[PDB]
A paper describes a structure:
T(SH)2 participates in crucial thiol-disulfide exchange reactions and serves as electron donor in the reduction of hydrogen peroxide to water catalyzed by the tryparedoxin/tryparedoxin peroxidase couple (TXN/TXNPx). Leishmania major TXNPx (LmTXNPx) is an obligate homodimer whose active site is formed by the N-proximal peroxidatic cysteine (Cp) from one subunit and a C-proximal resolving cysteine from the two-fold symmetry related subunit (Cr′)89. In the first reaction, oxidized TXNPx binds TXN, which reduces the inter-subunit disulfide bridge (Cp–Cr′) and, thereafter, is reduced by T(SH)2. In the second reaction, the Cp thiolate of a TXNPx monomer reduces the hydrogen peroxide to water and is oxidized to sulfenic acid (-SOH); the sulfenic Cp then reacts with the Cr′ of the two-fold symmetry related monomer forming a disulfide bridge.
In this paper, we report the X-ray crystal structure of LmTXNPx in FF conformation at high resolution. The overall structure of LmTXNPx-FF is very similar to that of LmTXNPx-LU. Both quaternary structures are pentamers of dimers assembled to form a toroidal ring with an outer diameter of 120 Å and an internal diameter of about 60 Å. Optimal structure superimposition between LmTXNPx-FF and LmTXNPx-LU highlights that conformational changes occur just in two regions: the 43–53 loop containing Cp (Cys52) and the C-terminal tail (residues 169–199) containing Cr′ (Cys173′). In LmTXNPx-FF Cp is part of the first turn of an α-helix, located in a narrow solvent-accessible pocket that constitutes the active site. Cp is hydrogen bonded to the highly conserved Thr49 and Arg128 residues, both of which are essential for catalysis. The C-terminal tail (residues 169–199), which is missing in LmTXNPx-LU, is completely visible in LmTXNPx-FF, thus revealing the complete active site structure of the protein. Cr′ is part of a loop and its side chain is embedded in a hydrophobic cavity formed by the 170–187 residues. The entrance to this active site cavity is covered by the short C-terminal α-helix (residues 187–195), which protects Cr′ from over-oxidation. Reduced LmTXNPx-FF is ready to exert its catalytic function, i.e., reduction of hydrogen peroxide to water, involving oxidation of Cp to sulphenic acid.
Residue numbers in the entry:
A (entry chain D), G (entry chain D): 3 to 198
B (entry chain C), E (entry chain B), F (entry chain A), H (entry chain C), I (entry chain B), J (entry chain A): 2 to 199
C (entry chain E), D (entry chain E): 2 to 198
Write the structure that this text describes.
Amino acid sequence: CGNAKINSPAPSFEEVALMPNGSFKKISLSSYKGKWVVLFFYPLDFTFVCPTEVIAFSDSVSRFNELNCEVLACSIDSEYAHLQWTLQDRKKGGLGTMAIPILADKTKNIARSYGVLEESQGVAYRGLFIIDPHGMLRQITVNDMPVGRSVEEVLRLLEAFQFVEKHGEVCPANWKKGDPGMKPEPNASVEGYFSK
Amino acid sequence: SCGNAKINSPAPSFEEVALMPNGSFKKISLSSYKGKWVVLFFYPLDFTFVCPTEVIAFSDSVSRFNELNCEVLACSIDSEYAHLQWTLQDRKKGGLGTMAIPILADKTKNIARSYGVLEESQGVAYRGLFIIDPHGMLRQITVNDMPVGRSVEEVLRLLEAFQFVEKHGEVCPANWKKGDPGMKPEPNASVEGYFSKQ
Amino acid sequence: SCGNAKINSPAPSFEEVALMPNGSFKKISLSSYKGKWVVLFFYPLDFTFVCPTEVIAFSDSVSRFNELNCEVLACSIDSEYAHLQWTLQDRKKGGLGTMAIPILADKTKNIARSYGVLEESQGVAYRGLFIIDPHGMLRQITVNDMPVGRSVEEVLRLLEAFQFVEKHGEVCPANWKKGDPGMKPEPNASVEGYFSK
Amino acid sequence: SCGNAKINSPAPSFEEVALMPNGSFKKISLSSYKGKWVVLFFYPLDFTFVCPTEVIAFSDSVSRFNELNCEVLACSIDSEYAHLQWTLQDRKKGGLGTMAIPILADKTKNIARSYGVLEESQGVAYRGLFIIDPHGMLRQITVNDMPVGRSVEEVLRLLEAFQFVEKHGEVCPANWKKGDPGMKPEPNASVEGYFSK
Amino acid sequence: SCGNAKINSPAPSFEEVALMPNGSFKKISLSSYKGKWVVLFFYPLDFTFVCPTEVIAFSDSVSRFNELNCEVLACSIDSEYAHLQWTLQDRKKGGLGTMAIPILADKTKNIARSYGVLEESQGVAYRGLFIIDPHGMLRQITVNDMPVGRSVEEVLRLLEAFQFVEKHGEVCPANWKKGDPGMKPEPNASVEGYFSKQ
Amino acid sequence: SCGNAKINSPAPSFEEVALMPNGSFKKISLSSYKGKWVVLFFYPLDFTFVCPTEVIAFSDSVSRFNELNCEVLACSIDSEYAHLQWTLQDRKKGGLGTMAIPILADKTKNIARSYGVLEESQGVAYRGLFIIDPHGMLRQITVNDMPVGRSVEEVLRLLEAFQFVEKHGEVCPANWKKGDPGMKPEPNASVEGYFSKQ
Amino acid sequence: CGNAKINSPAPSFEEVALMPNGSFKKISLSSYKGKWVVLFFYPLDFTFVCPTEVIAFSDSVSRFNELNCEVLACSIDSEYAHLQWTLQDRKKGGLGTMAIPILADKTKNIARSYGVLEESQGVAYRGLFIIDPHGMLRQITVNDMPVGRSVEEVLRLLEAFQFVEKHGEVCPANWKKGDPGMKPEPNASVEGYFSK
Amino acid sequence: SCGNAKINSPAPSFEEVALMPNGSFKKISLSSYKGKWVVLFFYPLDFTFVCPTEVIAFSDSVSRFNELNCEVLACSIDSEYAHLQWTLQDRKKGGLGTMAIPILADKTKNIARSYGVLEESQGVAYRGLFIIDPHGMLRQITVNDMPVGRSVEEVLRLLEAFQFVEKHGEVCPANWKKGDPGMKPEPNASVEGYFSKQ
Amino acid sequence: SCGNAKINSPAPSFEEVALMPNGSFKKISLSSYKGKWVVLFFYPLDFTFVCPTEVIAFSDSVSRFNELNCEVLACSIDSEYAHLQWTLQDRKKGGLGTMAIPILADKTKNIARSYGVLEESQGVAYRGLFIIDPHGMLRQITVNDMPVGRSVEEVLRLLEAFQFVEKHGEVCPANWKKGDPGMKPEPNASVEGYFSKQ
Amino acid sequence: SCGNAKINSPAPSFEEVALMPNGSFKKISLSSYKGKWVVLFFYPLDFTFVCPTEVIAFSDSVSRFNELNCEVLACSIDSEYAHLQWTLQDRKKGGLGTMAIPILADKTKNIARSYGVLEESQGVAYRGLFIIDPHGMLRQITVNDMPVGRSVEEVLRLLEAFQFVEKHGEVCPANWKKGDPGMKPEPNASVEGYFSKQ
Ligand SMILES: [Cl-]
Ligand SMILES: [Cl-]
Ligand SMILES: [Cl-]
Ligand SMILES: [Cl-]
Ligand SMILES: [Cl-]
Ligand SMILES: [Cl-]
Ligand SMILES: [Cl-]
Ligand SMILES: [Cl-]
């Protein structure tokens, strides 16, 4: 998916971001080594599905932070666009106060590198990436423009990947916190999981 | 994009042998799904761990996809003879048992390459799932690492969101489910119809 | 040349979505201006500092350009949705308010690229302004660094000069303004009519 | 960009023979101006029509540029021998008379090439003018078609604006002139200090 | 030559996961066989028809190889998990049963490619078999189309002819069999010792 | 593949002077054999050691190939003039005597090159033997190192197996000889008719 | 010599020239088919040897015209430069009234094509070319900057080439009008010329 | 420029066999003329028509060149043996007779190519004459078509003009001859010293 | 091959000025000799040493060639004017005198190049000689280094052997001489007719 | 030049198995001959027609070459094993019998290719003979078409001429044989000592 490959280092970047406090700051991906990161792109500030998603992630950021996971949004719009978007009322299609940084991918190269840039329109698809504390890409989700993502699904996936790293077990279809795992071995899988 | 799968381009086509649910072998083409939605999903290896849980999960729920005019198709790099034997193996011994969906045998691995979910060092497909519409256009991409399974309920959610989008000319907000209101993607209308009603 | 923009060559063409003065969205192509003078100006970013003063200044003066068979057209890399919000924001608060000129949304940035005014590392246009004739030929280039705005008066002087040149087959000396005489561009007549006086 | 001339990149360097104000011939290189603002202007041809009025206008005003730590430097594809004769010819007869600025003799035309103002089929420079800072960085581009001269006043406005920007860390709105206030280029301070007033 | 496999050149090297005789997975490399002869043999697909009969034949005959300082190694493009399940299936049901030889799982197909026996259109190996000597040099190539199985007797016949050659510095005539004389590969000695003695 | 010789593709084509059984020289084309099975076998050098014993063995068994609608064709890089002298030479003096098969004179070496069996260092062919069907399609490859002879009986076993295949639409297991059962290559019919009787 | 080769078509050109009457006019080389042409380059208007040569050729143009031969000067300077040069007094280093056209090779491509452009200075060497009525180059003369050409020599050469075309004879070293020719044949050369 | 001869670049160098005036053969190098002026002139063919008139003309006047520190060197594509024979041939029979200058034998034609005066369709040098100064820099180029000879008196004129230029730092006007005044190449000085004195 | 000159290929074609036997200049082309044999022979330089002796030898022997339907043609890189002067020089003074054969003047050297006999470092031809048959095909190549002349007797010997070959469809043994028998180029006829008859 | 064989450059190098006069096989290198003149001659095919008569003629005259410090070396594309059989074959049956010179077995054909004498269509050498001096420098090239034999006497004449050249610093005119005068290659001395006596 662009240069973004599962079990490869997530494409690095360093770019100006609108921060929670309203200020501008260069954020790099490497600066998150040690934590999980949910990087989500959306197409355009001031539009339709985009506000719902950004607000949803920002409002639920604590759910991610409790799990050693940071949240980053990104679009091709400027930091000044982002700022005004947060200064605009949610009832008017605005973001309001934000609890997550938003990158200004003004060169579009970040989205290009994640393979989610629609080149003819110059905007990102709804691509979301789960990156581990080693900097490794683990999960890709990309939606077409008119269909929003699911905060609940992304959290489910984060819990699963964490369960794997902690227990050296694998998570079956539909796993939620507290479901049993399976040992990825012929005999033990049958003994521990399949026979029940 | 993901291999040659780009959102809003035609889904890479293919014609490949599949294990049909009645146990026979049959060539399947992507083009033969025109007029319907298709959920195409890859998995790394027959006779392993998450893989059968996923194949069983979507097979067991296929009537739910088919009610929404959607077909399910599984795929891996294993042969049609391996698939067959997996379906003859009891679920309690890690098998598939009888299936209600086809399973492609991507022996050349080129279906998995064209979808951009092949792990070239090991020869196996990552957990890529692709939602394809009745015009054959790719609409959604899910790709999991090996040890973490997918979610049948999220695939149904996205399916209904896409069908709602195509019916009403509306868009679906974050976390949308069936019976939620959509939004008209116009500046004033979105405000008047959605953002203010919050 | 300035990218693909070369004086006395056709101005690079484009068809691109714009925020129309009435607040709708429409495709504008440069060839739709054939028959009229066009002033095209780029600016780096919506919701910034010198930029709004320039868009406001040209919008507010459009009739002075329309008087002279010249259209005015703004452009930046921002989307048409950003432009819309910027026009719905109060001038006192840093917005444009309602506009009397369209503004291109150069989302792929290829328009600024073709005009040679893209700061690539920033992905934003420098302050480029192009005077284009009824025949779609480029006649004047003006590019400013980011912190210094353009001059509406200067652009109007340039516009009247070009139009005087085309009408009278004469040339306009340094500092020319409307009312001033021109020079006939011939060795003898320039001395008699201009230099000796 | 404009040839190799890109805003906020170093102005393309050159070392080239010039007709010095005293009427001698000397090599001038652009790096010899480091520490000063430089206005470089090209013009098509000695012994023509708009050209002498522009060279005369900038020469005659040089002190106003020198006041502001800015040198002025003219350039055309003509030789230093043509420039010499042009200065020995009477202003009334179409000459420059004595000059207070140097004039480059860009005989290989590579200077105008590097500035992107060469009309190749004619082998002459369009009317390009470049404002370059003390650090040798390009800050402003102005190119006119052949029959329309530049404006000394406008160039001086641009020069004072740039210098104000560097001194005060502020930006200059559209139409700014000396005396006017600037804007602090920050979201809050721009509203309070400028937009609301 | 046969892909990269050239007679009297080092046989294409590899290091790959194998199903071992005890049903574990272990990375095997060809270089670890230096000092012994090796019969490497490919087959198209687990769970098919000629294939089990050859894997079983070479397994059952493994000691006849080991007596002659020769190891045996089977290979298909199938996963090591498919190999396992195949060893768990009854021979009377077309399974392998317990094996006395390792089976490589050439999941990238690059082993079969390096030996020039991949059918690219289907992604499976022809019935290629290679006799490699204690130095790692390829000595013999046998490749059968899919529907025709190989001969274990012939492979042992060749192994012994080669070992005869290496021992006595002589050559083996057509149809040479254990016990038969060879001939000195010299004009005069071939006539006096061999040709004139029929 | 083996140079340009690939299983289930057309055997590389050739047209070359051969020494005919009757002692004459004659151009022979491979395509002139369509309709018939062909066994084409290379040897490195006239007047050597393993070579005559192989040419002689194939020639002396020619009628058993002819009975199975199969021609036999020998080839080396030697001239047709050298081939004739060899047939004029006594078998007891390491000659061929009069032959019952033609011998190609592959003077350019392009035939052997096209079949992947040329040792370029010495400019002679390895012991490559190729089984080509009535359609011109290569079905089997056998390549031996210089010091070890091929097996006439093994070649006959292979022809009979392939002919059996094409006649009955069954496959030939490991070690199959004439009169052994074949197996239907289908999952159930292979178990019913073959595996269950093991 | 550049693209200029003896017995090849002289490199064609069409370029603005200062004419005898003081006007500007595009002149092409083809427009001289039927006449001889002496094309001479010089480096720079307003300089030293250059005036002497241009004046010498212009003053003696009738000598060329009597012989079906036109004269053309060329330099890299503009037509406006040329004009002012003719408006300047000969006593002051000027050309004065001119009886020949002067090309303005402002792109320098004409000199480039005659292989006489000194690229580092962007000016022509003192190259002179004799072209026949068929458009064929017949004679090349190139002087370094500080040494002027000879009008008398060029006329000598023109008379020689004309004698050749008229009589089918060749002109020996140092031939002047009315010197005998030689037939370019072994026997006749000895009989007619060498034996005397 | 003319081949590799450019005015104000070093004259292309060479070392070639020449017929010396005493009738011997000797290698000559351009570099061996350093410190002197050289007039190098090519001619198309020995035993022809204008050619000997030119060679004789410069040989007969060589003392005039040598008084001004200038050497004369002729050249053509003919061999040193042809040159020799031409000098043994009486002038009244079209010969050279004894010469007072060397004649290079440019047998490879590469001297004539490097000077850019070779007529490639016929293999012979055009009438190119080159004036070279004591630093080895090319200062003048004369090139005539075949049927029109050069002028020894013009070559002397140019020679003296160049030597005057180097002595006085002046330039030489159109038609300049010995004893004419030169001009200082400075704006005021040229006027005060020359243009006004006319 | 020898430059472009390959035995049994058309000899490099040319059309060039020659000095004719009557001392005129005429353009000669090789194609104008179709129907006859041609001996083309190169030599390095007019006015030298071995060269006249060979030109004279072939000239004096020209009728022996013409008797056998063979023309003779000499060639050097010298001009046709050098050739003329050489024919005007006395043989007792190392001249040619009157010639009975034409001499090409290969002034571009391209004839000698096409025949692969140019010495590039000196621009002269080695003593190359070519026997071309009535069809324009090259049959024989002889090339001598500069100090060693050719043999006319040997050239005639070869001409006759070739004409014998063409007439009788036989081959000429080593040292074959006019009058000698040839041999039928066939295994049986060569023995019965020739080898067994010494 | 003749492939890579050019006059006055080193004869292309080689190292190849040869059949030695004593009947043994031995690698022979050209460089092993420095110090000696060498005559290297190719023929197309063992067991043919002109070929044996040439090999025999050179072998039977070997001692006359040896006396002039010259070795003789024959070569064909045939194997050393074919060469031996040919020497074991009776001269009256078209054989060579025992030989007094070595015969190279140029099995790769690179020797003949490097000498420019390979007919690529048939893969055999033309009748190329090369005279190589004690420095390894090629001095003479002789190439005949297949049907015409070379001349032993002509080759001896050439050696003697070259040896004469190198001894006395004179050149050998057309038709020169031992005891004929040479000529000093200088204009006057050639006239004085040679031409004047004609
Ligand atoms: Cl836990
Ligand atoms: Cl609905
Ligand atoms: Cl008006
Ligand atoms: Cl101030
Ligand atoms: Cl049967
Ligand atoms: Cl006359
Ligand atoms: Cl003096
Ligand atoms: Cl002696």
